[PDB]
Amino acid sequence: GSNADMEMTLERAVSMLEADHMLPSRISAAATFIQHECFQKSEARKRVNQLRGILKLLQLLKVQNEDVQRAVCGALRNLVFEDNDNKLEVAELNGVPRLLQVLKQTRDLETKKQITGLLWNLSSNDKLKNLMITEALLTLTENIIIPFSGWPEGDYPKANGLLDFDIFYNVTGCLRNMSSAGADGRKAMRRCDGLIDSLVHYVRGTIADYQPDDKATENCVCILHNLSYQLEA
C-alpha cells in the first residue's frame, strides 16, 4: 500500500476524503480518481461502496469550491451508474436534497449537468421513483423545466443564462422515469404547477423550429403520455 508515496488507488482516494481539511486539491484529486475509475468499471463502483466512500463524498458537497463540486458530483454520477446498491445508498443517506441544494446554488453549468445526470441514474430504479417525486419533483420543475421551456410564450420570458439543452435533457430523462410511478405519483406530477404546460410548449416549439430529432422532445412526449389524463368526477 502507501508507504509515504502518492501512487493513487481507490483505497488511497477514499482515505483522502477526510471531512475536515477542506483542501480543494486533495479532495479534487481523490474524487476525480474515483470518477475516472468508476466511468467504465462496475467493480470500482462496488469497491467505493464497500470502502464507505459514498457518505464521504456526500459530506463534501458542503465545500464551496467549484473544482471540488465538479469532482464530487462527477464522482457520484459515475458511482450510481448501473449500480442499484449505490443508487439506494445515495437516496438513503439523504443525498437527494443535498444534491438539489448544490444544483440551485452553483453557477457552474457542468456541475448542473453532473447532478442532473446523477439524478437521472437514480430515477431508473423502480424503488426510487416515488421517493424522487417526493424529494425532487418540485425543484426539477421550477429550476430547470419551467425556465428553459420558454413557457408561457405570450409572457415573453427572458432567457436563462445558467441552463442549457444538456441540463434540460437530463431532467426530462429524470421526469420520464418518474412518470412511470404508480397512480399517486403520477397525480403529484400532473398537478405540479406549470410542468405539463411547459413540456407541451417545448414539444410544440421544436416542431415549429424544425428540430424533429430533438431527444428532449422524445422524453417530453413520453412523460405526457404517462401523465396527461384525468379521471371523471
Distance CA 76, CA 178 (A): 20
Cell of 228: 396527461
Residue 13: HSE in the Cβ half-sphere, 13 Å Cα cutoff = 25
What resolution in angstroms does the PDB record give?
1.5
Distance CA 8, CA 29 (A): 9
Domain residue spans of the chain? 1-233
Contact 141, 100 (CB under 8 A): no
Looking at domain 1-233, what is its CATH homologous superfamily? Answer: Leucine-rich Repeat Variant (1.25.10.10)
User: Shortest CA distance to 123 belongs to which of 106, 113, 135?
Assistant: 135
216: CB partners within 8 A, 6+ apart: 165, 168, 169, 172, 202, 206
Cell of 103: 444544483
Contact 78, 48 (CB under 8 A): no
